[PDB]
Amino acid sequence: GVPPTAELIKDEAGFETGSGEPQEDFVADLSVDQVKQIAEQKHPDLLSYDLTNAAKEVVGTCTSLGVTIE
Template identity: 35%
Template sequence: MSKKVVRVMKIQFKAGQAKPGPALAGAGIQMPKFCTAFNDQTKDRMGETVPVVLTVYEDKSFDFILKTAPASEMIKKACNLKKAASDSKQTVATLSADKLKEIAEYKMPDLNAIDIEGAMKIIAGTARNMGVKVEGLDA
């Protein structure tokens, strides 16, 4: 018999650094158990923000799915930026086509794209909104 789902949450933690706190307080799970499991699974991704889809069941057990790092974080890292532009018309950096493809390939499992070209267009759109010019693409 399948368990009854009580709640599905989308949250983010730094890899290997999840701690019991407000983000998990409303979930109704054993926070230390989740934190240990999350930290063990993400220790190889240190420094990265990891989105998580947390499914909580009626018996207070849980499952979680790790997603890829946010595209904006990856673009900032690739361009060596601390912060994106406050206005998308302002250009703060340039992203090479190679880096764009690398990010798109990494993000592909979490994107709603059929092929790598579609994924690259999605990532390029995120970059443009951040004020990052993408080399090799027509604006």
């Protein structure tokens, strides 16, 4: 239902395309707060019980695109 993760990130990230090489090329950043919201938009699309785990999933695509956290 709710749109995919990859896109949700590209919104608050402020960018469109990722980097040719993930983690090796940091495209954008994301405050944990921001990530706490994205994890709130996909409450159903995820199996995780706590919001913590929900973030681990979301925070699983970021670093693999150059989406660092602060």
